[PDB]
């Protein structure tokens, strides 16, 4: 069934599962042509495939060459996503394949179902959550590796850094979704908060700053405040 606030804790049990977000697969800038018409120019994208229990992020970079000479690219992007997710699963050892794949947008269901026909015991699920995974390209290292790619490329990151050494998966996913919700609603403010302090650094192989537990509490509070303010503004409440 669909994943929602009621069955949220299921993300952190010991059944392997992956979220797949396709919101950054097909990315364009819209511009005017010499004649004054509008055209698109694609830029590199990525599939965001995340194990929420472990923090594994299989970031499949989608190079602009995959669109060359193709029509209906927004439609093709969904099928390319499903092709790449199926290929990831096939590459994985049997004991490392997911039992569920949760897609963040319902339009991924049929393409993934069709590409996963060879895996009838892998459940393809939608979700009622409004997850902020689109903001993944606001994470500097992730954006940088996508834009620099010259060919199709899979890059492997822990999106939780080593937080799991001190906190649970549930808490790590909550912190991740808060940071991403913040970056999505006001990227500039969010980034100011994370890097304001020159003494707090990001390890060479990590994505986020090396906050102590107490600094994380302050950071998380600052991020919550950012999000509620923007919300008032959005609705005049």
């Amino acid at each position: 069934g669909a994943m929602n606030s009621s069955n949220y804790a299921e993300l952190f049990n010991n059944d392997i599962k992956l979220f797949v977000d396709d919101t950054n697969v097909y990315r364009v800038t819209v511009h005017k042509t010499f004649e004054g018409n509008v055209a698109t120019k694609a830029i590199n994208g990525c599939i965001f495939t995340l194990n929420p229990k472990t923090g594994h992020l299989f970031l499949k970079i989608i190079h602009t060459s995959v669109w060359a000479g193709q029509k209906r690219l927004s439609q093709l992007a969904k099928w390319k996503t499903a092709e790449e997710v199926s290929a990831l699963v096939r590459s994985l050892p049997k004991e490392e394949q997911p039992k569920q794949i949760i897609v963040t947008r319902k339009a991924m269901l049929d393409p993934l179902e069709v590409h996963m026909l060879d895996f009838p015991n892998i459940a393809i699920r939608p979700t009622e959550l409004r997850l902020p995974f689109s903001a993944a390209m606001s994470i500097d290292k992730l954006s940088d590796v996508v834009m620099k790619a010259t060919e199709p490329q899979m890059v492997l990151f822990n999106i939780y850094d080593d937080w799991l050494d001190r906190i649970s998966s549930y808490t790590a996913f909550s912190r991740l979704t808060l940071l991403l919700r913040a970056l999505k609603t006001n990227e500039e403010s969010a980034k100011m908060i994370l890097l304001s302090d020159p003494t707090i650094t990001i390890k060479s192989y990590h994505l986020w700053p090396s906050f102590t537990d107490e600094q994380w509490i302050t950071i998380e509070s600052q991020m919550r405040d950012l999000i509620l303010t923007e919300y008032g503004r959005k609705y005049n409440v």
Binding site: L76, W79, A82, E83, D110, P111, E113, V114, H115, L117, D118
Partner: protein
């Protein structure tokens, strides 16, 4: 012209014969139906006055034998039977006709409706969908489930329609996932037409038989099958031109004959809107699109 005599009519029942229907009273002197056109299959069907549930009936072809109806008070239904003795049969019928105790198959000469609804329906194909090889005729009722439905309980009583499933390995070539899902022509033309049905006539025969079972018996699995076979053609970019023209004629007469008050349950909104307005063949069903618009504009 052939005859289906009745032994008697012990219980009050509405009897249908093809698209016609007659009310018969309990123990009314009624001994059958005469003047049935030769050359087509036919269906004779029943709805008891006391149980508007379970419509049931028999598909038959009078070229294949002499058939009659007799009520069974133990099983509680009108049963079709075959009479092997040609002379015994002629004699029974002749007597009943002489006593003018038979209704006449009420065919208007101008009317091609039944031909148009059964053009490709062949008794031998019905008998493979409805498996009961001791009889030459086939029983169908409202409740019988299809094989495909059974996959998702009694095999002997199933409708063995050809299983169509758009998200299946049979439908989707490895490496052509998107292509085959968005353009079902290889499923239609290679898998179904060339492989399973052998020709478009057998495909149309099963489509027409599914519609008629849905219409006469409210058989839900039959309706599912009818719509699936329509959607497979409409979702195919490449269809022989003779098939498209014939499909338009087939569906026109099905939509024409459908009871106006059943269009709610018998017509699937998504399939018809996708077929008439989004699919590859949105522009290939002019007659069907025109009768749907002027009769069921609500559904669309």
């Amino acid at each position: 012209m052939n005859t289906v005599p009745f032994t008697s009519a012990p219980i009050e029942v509405t009897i249908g014969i093809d698209q016609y229907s007659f009310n018969v009273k309990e123990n009314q002197p009624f001994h059958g139906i005469k003047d049935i056109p030769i050359g087509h299959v036919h269906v004779i069907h029943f709805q008891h006055a006391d149980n508007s549930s379970m419509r049931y009936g028999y598909w038959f072809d009078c070229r294949m034998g002499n058939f009659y109806i007799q009520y069974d008070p133990k099983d509680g239904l009108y049963k079709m039977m075959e009479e092997r003795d040609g002379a015994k049969f002629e004699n029974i019928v002749h007597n009943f006709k002489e006593r003018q105790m038979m209704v006449s198959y009420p065919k208007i000469d101008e009317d091609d409706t039944w031909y148009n609804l059964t053009e490709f329906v062949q008794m031998d194909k019905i008998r493979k969908i409805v498996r009961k090889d001791e009889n030459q005729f086939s029983y169908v009722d409202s409740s019988m489930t299809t094989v495909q439905e059974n996959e998702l309980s009694d095999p002997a009583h199933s409708l063995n329609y050809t299983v169509i499933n758009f998200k299946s390995r049979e439908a989707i070539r490895p490496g052509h996932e998107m292509e085959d899902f968005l353009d079902k022509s290889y499923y239609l033309n290679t898998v179904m037409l060339q492989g399973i049905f052998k020709n478009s006539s057998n495909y149309f025969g099963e489509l027409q038989f599914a519609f008629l079972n849905a219409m006469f018996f409210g058989n839900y699995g039959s309706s599912l099958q009818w719509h699936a076979m329509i959607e497979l053609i409409c979702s195919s970019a490449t269809v022989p031109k003779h098939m498209l023209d014939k499909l338009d004629e087939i569906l026109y007469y099905q939509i024409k004959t459908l009871p106006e008050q059943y269009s709610d349950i018998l017509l699937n909104e998504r399939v018809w809107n996708i077929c008439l307005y989004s699919s590859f063949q949105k522009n290939s069903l002019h007659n069907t699109e025109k009768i749907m618009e002027n009769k069921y504009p609500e559904l669309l």
